[PDB]
Design an enzyme around this catalytic site. Structure first.
Site, PDB file in Angstrom:
ATOM      1  N   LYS A   1     -13.414  98.499 126.789  1.00  0.00           N
ATOM      2  CA  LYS A   1     -13.700  97.323 125.977  1.00  0.00           C
ATOM      3  C   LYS A   1     -15.190  97.083 125.770  1.00  0.00           C
ATOM      4  O   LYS A   1     -15.561  96.380 124.823  1.00  0.00           O
ATOM      5  CB  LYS A   1     -13.066  96.083 126.612  1.00  0.00           C
ATOM      6  CG  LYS A   1     -11.547  96.133 126.679  1.00  0.00           C
ATOM      7  CD  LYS A   1     -10.976  94.859 127.279  1.00  0.00           C
ATOM      8  CE  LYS A   1      -9.464  94.943 127.413  1.00  0.00           C
ATOM      9  NZ  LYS A   1      -8.791  94.974 126.084  1.00  0.00           N
TER      10      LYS A   1
ATOM     11  N   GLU B   1      -6.724  95.830 115.455  1.00  0.00           N
ATOM     12  CA  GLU B   1      -6.293  94.449 115.621  1.00  0.00           C
ATOM     13  C   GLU B   1      -7.437  93.499 115.292  1.00  0.00           C
ATOM     14  O   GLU B   1      -8.597  93.774 115.612  1.00  0.00           O
ATOM     15  CB  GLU B   1      -5.801  94.200 117.049  1.00  0.00           C
ATOM     16  CG  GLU B   1      -4.888  95.288 117.589  1.00  0.00           C
ATOM     17  CD  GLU B   1      -4.001  94.798 118.716  1.00  0.00           C
ATOM     18  OE1 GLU B   1      -4.262  93.697 119.243  1.00  0.00           O
ATOM     19  OE2 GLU B   1      -3.038  95.510 119.070  1.00  0.00           O
TER      20      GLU B   1
ATOM     21  N   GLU C   1     -10.249  95.181 119.732  1.00  0.00           N
ATOM     22  CA  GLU C   1      -9.482  96.294 120.289  1.00  0.00           C
ATOM     23  C   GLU C   1      -8.970  97.256 119.222  1.00  0.00           C
ATOM     24  O   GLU C   1      -8.649  96.849 118.100  1.00  0.00           O
ATOM     25  CB  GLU C   1      -8.310  95.769 121.129  1.00  0.00           C
ATOM     26  CG  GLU C   1      -7.563  96.841 121.907  1.00  0.00           C
ATOM     27  CD  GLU C   1      -6.434  96.277 122.744  1.00  0.00           C
ATOM     28  OE1 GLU C   1      -6.196  95.052 122.677  1.00  0.00           O
ATOM     29  OE2 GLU C   1      -5.783  97.060 123.468  1.00  0.00           O
TER      30      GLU C   1
ATOM     31  N   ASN D   1      -6.097 100.515 119.097  1.00  0.00           N
ATOM     32  CA  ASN D   1      -5.082 101.279 119.814  1.00  0.00           C
ATOM     33  C   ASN D   1      -5.057 102.706 119.281  1.00  0.00           C
ATOM     34  O   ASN D   1      -4.778 102.930 118.099  1.00  0.00           O
ATOM     35  CB  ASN D   1      -3.708 100.628 119.672  1.00  0.00           C
ATOM     36  CG  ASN D   1      -3.639  99.268 120.332  1.00  0.00           C
ATOM     37  OD1 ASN D   1      -3.475  98.248 119.664  1.00  0.00           O
ATOM     38  ND2 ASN D   1      -3.764  99.245 121.654  1.00  0.00           N
TER      39      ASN D   1
ATOM     40  N   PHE E   1      10.476  82.187 129.530  1.00  0.00           N
ATOM     41  CA  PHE E   1      10.570  82.891 128.252  1.00  0.00           C
ATOM     42  C   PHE E   1      10.962  84.356 128.422  1.00  0.00           C
ATOM     43  O   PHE E   1      10.639  85.190 127.571  1.00  0.00           O
ATOM     44  CB  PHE E   1       9.262  82.786 127.459  1.00  0.00           C
ATOM     45  CG  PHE E   1       8.934  81.390 127.016  1.00  0.00           C
ATOM     46  CD1 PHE E   1       9.826  80.666 126.244  1.00  0.00           C
ATOM     47  CD2 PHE E   1       7.732  80.801 127.372  1.00  0.00           C
ATOM     48  CE1 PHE E   1       9.527  79.382 125.835  1.00  0.00           C
ATOM     49  CE2 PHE E   1       7.427  79.517 126.968  1.00  0.00           C
ATOM     50  CZ  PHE E   1       8.326  78.806 126.198  1.00  0.00           C
TER      51      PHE E   1
HETATM   52  N1  LIG Z   1     -12.258  85.773 122.290  1.00  0.00           N
HETATM   53  C1  LIG Z   1     -10.848  85.446 122.400  1.00  0.00           C
HETATM   54  N2  LIG Z   1     -10.660  84.231 121.913  1.00  0.00           N
HETATM   55  C2  LIG Z   1      -9.420  83.689 121.901  1.00  0.00           C
HETATM   56  N3  LIG Z   1      -8.371  84.391 122.386  1.00  0.00           N
HETATM   57  C3  LIG Z   1      -8.558  85.627 122.881  1.00  0.00           C
HETATM   58  C4  LIG Z   1      -9.780  86.163 122.893  1.00  0.00           C
HETATM   59  N4  LIG Z   1      -9.689  87.386 123.432  1.00  0.00           N
HETATM   60  C5  LIG Z   1      -8.411  87.604 123.750  1.00  0.00           C
HETATM   61  N5  LIG Z   1      -7.712  86.519 123.410  1.00  0.00           N
HETATM   62  C6  LIG Z   1      -6.298  86.299 123.566  1.00  0.00           C
HETATM   63  O1  LIG Z   1      -5.732  87.225 124.768  1.00  0.00           O
HETATM   64  C7  LIG Z   1      -4.819  88.018 124.275  1.00  0.00           C
HETATM   65  C8  LIG Z   1      -5.396  89.446 124.086  1.00  0.00           C
HETATM   66  O2  LIG Z   1      -4.345  90.337 123.850  1.00  0.00           O
HETATM   67  P1  LIG Z   1      -4.686  91.944 123.716  1.00  0.00           P
HETATM   68  O3  LIG Z   1      -5.970  92.130 122.944  1.00  0.00           O
HETATM   69  O4  LIG Z   1      -3.558  92.636 122.990  1.00  0.00           O
HETATM   70  O5  LIG Z   1      -4.842  92.600 125.219  1.00  0.00           O
HETATM   71  P2  LIG Z   1      -4.344  94.128 125.574  1.00  0.00           P
HETATM   72  O6  LIG Z   1      -3.706  94.151 126.943  1.00  0.00           O
HETATM   73  O7  LIG Z   1      -5.531  95.061 125.551  1.00  0.00           O
HETATM   74  N6  LIG Z   1      -3.207  94.614 124.403  1.00  0.00           N
HETATM   75  P3  LIG Z   1      -2.650  96.221 124.345  1.00  0.00           P
HETATM   76  O8  LIG Z   1      -3.505  97.085 125.240  1.00  0.00           O
HETATM   77  O9  LIG Z   1      -2.732  96.730 122.926  1.00  0.00           O
HETATM   78  O10 LIG Z   1      -1.216  96.273 124.815  1.00  0.00           O
HETATM   79  C9  LIG Z   1      -4.427  87.413 122.915  1.00  0.00           C
HETATM   80  O11 LIG Z   1      -3.376  86.568 123.062  1.00  0.00           O
HETATM   81  C10 LIG Z   1      -5.674  86.631 122.467  1.00  0.00           C
HETATM   82  O12 LIG Z   1      -5.262  85.400 121.726  1.00  0.00           O
HETATM   83 MG   LIG Z   2      -4.100  94.724 122.576  1.00  0.00          MG
END
Ligand SMILES: Nc1ncnc2c1ncn2[C@@H]1O[C@H](COP(=O)(O)OP(=O)(O)NP(=O)(O)O)[C@@H](O)[C@H]1O
Ligand SMILES: [Mg+2]
Ligand SMILES: CCC(=O)SCCNC(=O)CCNC(=O)[C@H](O)C(C)(C)COP(=O)(O)OP(=O)(O)OC[C@H]1O[C@@H](n2cnc3c(N)ncnc32)[C@H](O)[C@@H]1OP(=O)(O)O
Ligand SMILES: *C(=O)CCCC[C@@H]1SC[C@@H]2NC(=O)N[C@@H]21
Lengths: 247, 673, 261
Positions: free
Chosen positions: B122, B281, B294, B296, B354
């Site tokens: 990241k 995304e 991010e 993928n 949920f």
């Molecule tokens: N700067 C931010 N501001 C508000 N919400 C955030 C922020 N960063 C992350 N989030 C929230 O945290 C969650 C991030 O999800 P995600 O980016 O998919 O993590 P991930 O585990 O890397 N997904 P993946 O690896 O594709 O399975 C989301 O629900 C966002 O709304």
């Molecule tokens: Mg993600």
């Protein structure tokens, strides 16, 4: 409810290894119409299953073993529990359906001291005296005299079927190997050949002791057509006031 | 589906579930021999029999079956596979797998090692995006070492700032703070939990975005330097940071913003030199401002829903790219065609947090493949089993139509016409979400499930008319069963004198209320009067089919009778939710008032050993508060192992039986409930 | 010149001498008689007609295709005779040949004898001494047991059936005496059990010997399987004759009436 409904769920209900247990009530629910089963004595002698069900609208009698409890071995209580139900179904012209999964009789000192022989003879007699049509399906296991006691072909049975995972043998492979090849004192390979040629339903099939080897998914259709065919059965017996139940 | 072009001859699918089945379908349609792998447990899955050869990989746990590198190595060596497919998850991201496959002679269907290494962390991803002149969330640059750094940065970025755990992820490690002391304690908590989560301990500070929309972008690339963005997607309905309901076309955005986001994604992919199928995304606020978040580097689970709107096969194109052929489409060759909605079916209970994992064996399984515009991607068959080592994934339901409303109606019909018996599912929640007023209007966000149901999911709140319809349907079904019970065959010795009752007076108990119902039969039409209201229920009245369709005052409804007992209890699934009713005659209801209420407080504390068998092992740890989804111990007896698995929430006050402990029948094993 | 006459003499002497002199000496060492002299003691002298004397087993597996594993009669002696002038059918088992294990020929001879008895309407007397089912036959022994059980069940209530255990009977052969009307045993020499003590040790891990597991006292005092016990074989056979003097020949005949004083 169609009489030729397929039941693909039974194609893998039996575990491939012989040490795992399963529930025969699931199979009973699968086979019977509308999955309705009135179980008799569900909390007493849980190693045997007896109850009332319907196939193509006709009342039938269901007898089977429960490998989940005590590995399905027969004992004193289950013998009379099955025998009385079989006799009652006999008395009022109700067909019987049998599922066989048994490794033998329960051993120990209590069962022998309590008279296991009399109740085993009770069950064997109750099955042998039968005149109503009977259909028997062998799922996994049939060892020793329990196979004969459980409505084998030679007790005037009508039709018998065996699943591909079933097998009929005199007794255990280990015991048979150690009691046959005693002088050879080499069980490394002999066990392998013994389980390769006898741990399968072919020795019983080639002798005509079972009609065919069928897939588990056609059991309902096979039983329905056999019951429809065997509705006109009539067998004559020598005259007698009454016979001698071993009570 | 042109087979004239020469392609690979044998493909290996190193995954499990619905994705393996989809890959096998795609290779079979291309006339390519397929190779599959499986663990010991999954020896009877649909994907192992639907393929042609099979190669075992090891035991049940995923740490030794699908994550075992050497087993796959000899699998490829024995099968002489010319290509390998990782699917998604598992090894689809591990770079060492890709490099070792690409080393000797094997091509890897996926992105190159450099791209995965770049967009695998990241910290470097955001720096590359900033170098790629794409919009990003404002935030602190570098890793914060102490709360003093965090607070000084918070001076110039404000209080609504979220401390994020660098690397790792999985929908965890994000904490919300709004105060300086709150900032310092949150920083301390994140530093403490980073070691527990992944151990990297690197921390990220970034500005929180309020009320965000998760807009999803699909991109496709090749080795010749061509990139295509296949429209967008929206994944906003999430619980535990996991998507459940997906919509292919975005109702929020217009053409201009969509084009801008697609161009930005294509530029970022060109900068990364992506040469496979991938996704980007974005987070979009209320003011139509989007920031990168991010990338993928694998196939997305949501690919079918974006394939429906474009008519393109993603797996086919990705395989052709892996071969080396260039794309046959241009950015002007992609158009949006209709609408598409996708919901994810899980083997979980939607009544607790949920969703809670569940286990079981499926006794009945049917899909509504005869309904119009319905596509089902399932890796399950009747008789299958749901284990604890893998995803509780069941099936993906995809529907398409000319517009949003028709697609939603078709998806609701498909959900109502879906049969699963044996395990608890989340179909009720999925059907309830798609009929919500806000979702229909189009005002949704990532916190949609956290505010519409503050106290958690409870079911479908049925109105007066729906309650009357349910009561009429239940009474009609009860009377139909009672009437069917009286049809015997001719005996010729004692003729049967059928009773000539005209009107059936019943008492139906729903929730905590009692309603008086009068029902009459006039052949195949029922006249039901529920507290003055008059309704007509007519149908073919098939009591054996799992699905029964009835007509209540012209309206067509579909109901399922899950359970039925002679005592009057009935479980019927109406509009997705399962309602329990008690139906009795008036005389029986009047006489039931004299029955004393039976109390069953019991003890349910000491768990005596069911059988004298010896406890071979105890998988669980002393003092566990786990509710469901896990067994306790396995007991050996008579050459047989029997497990006292409990689906009921039993708190472990103390463990009295350990591994290799001999216990007779009637001996306390573990203090449970 | 044909050798079909000396063959008859050799087969007859082999059948009369059982499976060897050493096994007969071992049998006598434990104070246990032989089947032929048992039948001679039981029946009136000069009234026994033997049938199926030359029957041999047809096994062709596990090396019994050789001559050393071939014995005429197949460890069973069957026939008909008279007791105090009344007809009766009797079969006896020989522990010398293969431990008395039942095979296709053994069950076939028993079934033919029982069929003749039920056709004519005469009682059946059985002297049971067998080590169980023949293990190498396979399902053939199970088929024989099932056929014998079927014929035992069919004839119940039509003609009397008596069983007299004189040795260790185990396996599935124990259900045939249980289906008969009356069962008798011999003390210190007769045993009746389904599983051996070794299996008990392997399964339930509890020390037990053969005598207390299946002895005459165990089944005659508080188990209810046997009806009476006798110390030796001659007295047992005399009492069996005395008891058979009570029973009628068939259910179609009234109770016997004898001269009274
Ligand atoms: N700067 C931010 N501001 C508000 N919400 C955030 C922020 N960063 C992350 N989030 C929230 O945290 C969650 C991030 O999800 P995600 O980016 O998919 O993590 P991930 O585990 O890397 N997904 P993946 O690896 O594709 O399975 C989301 O629900 C966002 O709304
Ligand atoms: Mg993600
Ligand atoms: C239908 C039900 C089944 O499936 S029963 C499966 C067989 N289970 C067993 O445990 C074997 C049965 N045998 C026994 O239990 C014991 O040997 C009993 C019956 C108590 C005999 O006691 P005992 O007097 O000590 O025998 P022994 O040592 O003198 O042996 C002499 C010869 O007898 C023979 N014998 C015995 N049983 C069988 C049998 N079932 N099948 C074939 N032969 C049998 C033995 O082969 C032995 O021969 P040999 O002299 O050692 O060469
Ligand atoms: C194991 O492979 C078999 C040895 C244990 C024998 C058990 S005991 C009870 C059943 N009856 C029988 O004859 N064999 C079975």
């Amino acid at each position: 409810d169609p009489s030729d409904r397929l039941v693909p769920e039974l194609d893998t209900i039996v575990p491939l290894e012989s040490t795992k247990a399963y529930n025969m009530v699931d199979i009973i629910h699968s086979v019977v119409d509308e999955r309705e089963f009135f179980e008799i004595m569900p909390n007493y002698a849980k190693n045997i299953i007896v109850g009332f069900a319907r196939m193509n609208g006709r009342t039938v009698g269901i007898v089977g073993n429960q490998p989940k409890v005590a590995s399905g071995c027969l004992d004193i209580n289950s013998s009379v529990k099955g025998a009385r139900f079989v006799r009652f179904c006999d008395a009022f012209n109700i067909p019987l359906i049998t599922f066989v999964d048994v490794p033998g009789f329960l051993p120990g000192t209590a069962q022998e001291y309590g008279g296991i022989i009399r109740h085993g003879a009770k069950l064997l007699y109750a099955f042998a005296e039968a005149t109503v049509p009977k259909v028997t399906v062998i799922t996994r296991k049939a060892y020793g005299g329990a196979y004969d006691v459980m409505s084998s072909k030679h007790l005037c049975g009508d039709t018998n079927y065996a699943w591909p995972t079933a097998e009929i043998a005199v007794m255990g492979a280990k015991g048979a190997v150690e009691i046959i090849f005693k002088g050879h004192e080499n069980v490394e390979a002999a066990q392998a050949e013994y389980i390769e040629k006898f741990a399968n339903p072919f020795p019983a099939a080639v002798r005509g002791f079972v009609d065919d080897i069928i897939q588990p998914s056609s059991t309902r259709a096979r039983i329905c057509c056999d019951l429809d065919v065997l509705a006109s059965k009539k067998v004559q017996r020598p005259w007698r006031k009454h016979a001698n139940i071993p009570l | 589906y042109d087979p004239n072009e020469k392609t690979f001859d044998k493909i290996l699918v190193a995954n499990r579930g619905e994705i393996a089945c989809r890959v096998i379908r795609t290779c079979k349609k291309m006339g390519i021999k397929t190779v599959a792998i499986h663990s010991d447990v999954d020896a009877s899955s649909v994907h192992v029999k639907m393929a042609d050869e099979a190669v075992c990989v090891g035991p049940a746990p995923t740490s030794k079956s699908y994550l075992n590198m050497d087993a796959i190595m000899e699998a490829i060596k024995k099968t002489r596979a010319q290509a390998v497919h990782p699917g998604y998850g598992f090894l689809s991201e591990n770079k060492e797998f890709a490099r070792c496959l690409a080393a000797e002679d094997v091509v890897f269907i996926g992105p190159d090692t450099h791209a995965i290494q770049a967009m695998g962390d990241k910290i470097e991803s955001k720096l590359l995006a900033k170098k790629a002149e794409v919009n990003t969330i404002p935030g602190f640059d570098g890793v914060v070492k102490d709360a003093e750094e965090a607070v000084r940065i918070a001076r110039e970025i404000g209080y609504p700032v979220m401390i994020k755990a660098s690397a790792g992820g999985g929908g965890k490690g994000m904490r919300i703070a709004w105060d300086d002391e709150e900032t310092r304690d949150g920083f301390r908590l994140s530093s403490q939990e980073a070691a527990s989560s992944f151990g990297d301990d690197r921390l990220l500070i970034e500005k929180f975005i309020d009320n965000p929309r998760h807009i999803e972008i699909q991109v496709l690339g090749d080795k010749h330097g061509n990139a295509l963005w296949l429209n967008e997607r929206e994944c906003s309905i999430q619980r535990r940071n996991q998507k459940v309901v997906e919509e292919a076309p975005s109702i929020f955005l217009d053409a201009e913003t969509r084009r801008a986001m697609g161009e930005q994604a294509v530029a970022l992919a060109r900068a990364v030199k992506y040469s496979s199928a991938g996704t980007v995304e974005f987070l979009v606020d209320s003011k139509k401002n989007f920031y990168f978040l991010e990338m993928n580097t694998r196939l997305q689970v949501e690919h079918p829903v974006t394939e429906c709107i474009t008519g393109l096969d993603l797996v086919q194109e990705m395989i052709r790219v892996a071969k080396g052929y260039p794309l046959r489409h241009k950015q002007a060759d992609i158009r949006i065609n209709g609408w598409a909605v996708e919901c994810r079916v899980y083997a979980e209970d939607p009544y607790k947090s949920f969703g809670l994992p569940s286990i079981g064996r499926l006794s009945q399984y049917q899909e509504p493949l005869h309904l119009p515009g319905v596509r089902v991607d399932s890796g399950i068959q009747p008789g299958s089993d749901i284990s604890i080592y893998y995803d509780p994934m069941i099936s993906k339901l995809i529907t398409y139509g000319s517009d949003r409303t028709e697609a939603l109606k078709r998806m609701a019909d498909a959900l109502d016409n879906y049969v699963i018996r044996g395990v608890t599912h989340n179909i009720a929640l999925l059907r309830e979400v798609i009929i919500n007023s806000r979702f229909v209007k189009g005002d949704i966000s990532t916190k949609f499930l956290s505010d519409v149901y503050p106290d958690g999911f409870k079911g479908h709140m049925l109105t007066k008319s729906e309650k009357n319809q349910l009561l009429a349907i239940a009474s009609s079904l009860f009377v139909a069963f009672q009437l069917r019970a009286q049809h015997f065959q001719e005996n010729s010795r004692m003729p049967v004198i059928k009773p000539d009752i005209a009107n059936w007076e019943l008492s139906v108990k729903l929730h905590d209320k009692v309603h008086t119902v009068v029902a009459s039969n006039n052949g195949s039409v029922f006249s039901v009067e529920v507290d003055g209201s008059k309704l007509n229920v007519t149908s073919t009245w098939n009591l054996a089919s799992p699905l029964l369709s009835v007509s209540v005052d012209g309206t067509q409804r579909t109901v399922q009778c899950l359970s039925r007992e002679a005592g009057g209890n009935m479980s019927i699934q109406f509009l997705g939710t399962v309602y329990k009713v008690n139906i009795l005659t008036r005389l029986a209801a009047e006489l039931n008032k004299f029955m004393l209420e039976k109390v069953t407080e019991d003890t349910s504390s000491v768990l005596r050993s069911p059988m004298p068998g010896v406890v071979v092992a105890v998988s669980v740890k002393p003092g566990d508060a786990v509710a469901e989804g896990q067994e306790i111990c396995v007991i050996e007896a008579m050459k047989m192992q029997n497990s006292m698995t409990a689906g009921k929430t039993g708190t472990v006050k103390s463990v009295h039986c350990q591994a290799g402990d001999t216990v007779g029948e009637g001996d306390l094993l573990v203090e449970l409930e | 010149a044909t050798s079909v006459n000396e063959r008859i003499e050799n087969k007859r002497r082999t059948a009369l001498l059982g499976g060897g002199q050493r096994r007969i000496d071992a049998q006598h060492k434990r104070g246990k008689l032989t089947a032929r002299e048992r039948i001679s003691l039981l029946l009136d002298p000069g009234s026994f007609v033997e049938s199926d004397m030359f029957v041999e087993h047809r096994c062709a597996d596990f090396g019994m295709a050789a001559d050393k594993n071939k014995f005429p009669g197949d460890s069973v002696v069957t026939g008909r005779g008279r007791i105090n002038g009344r007809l009766v059918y009797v079969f006896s088992q020989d522990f010398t040949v293969f431990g008395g294990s039942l095979s296709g020929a053994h069950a076939q001879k028993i079934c033919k004898i029982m069929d003749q008895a039920i056709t004519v309407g005469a009682p059946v007397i059985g002297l049971n001494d067998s080590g169980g089912a023949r293990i190498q036959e396979g399902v053939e022994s199970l088929a024989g047991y099932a056929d014998i059980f079927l014929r035992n069940v069919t004839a119940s209530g039509v003609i009397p059936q008596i069983s007299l255990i004189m040795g260790p009977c185990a396996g599935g052969a124990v259900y045939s005496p249980a289906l008969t009307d009356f069962t008798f045993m011999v003390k210190d020499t007769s045993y009746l059990f389904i599983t051996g003590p070794d299996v008990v040790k392997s399964v339930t891990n509890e020390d037990v010997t053969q005598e207390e597991l299946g002895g005459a006292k165990t089944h005659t005092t508080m188990s209810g399987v046997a009806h009476r016990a006798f110390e030796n074989d001659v007295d047992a056979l005399c009492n069996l004759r005395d008891f058979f003097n009570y029973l009628p020949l068939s259910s179609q005949d009234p109770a016997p009436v004898r001269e009274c004083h």
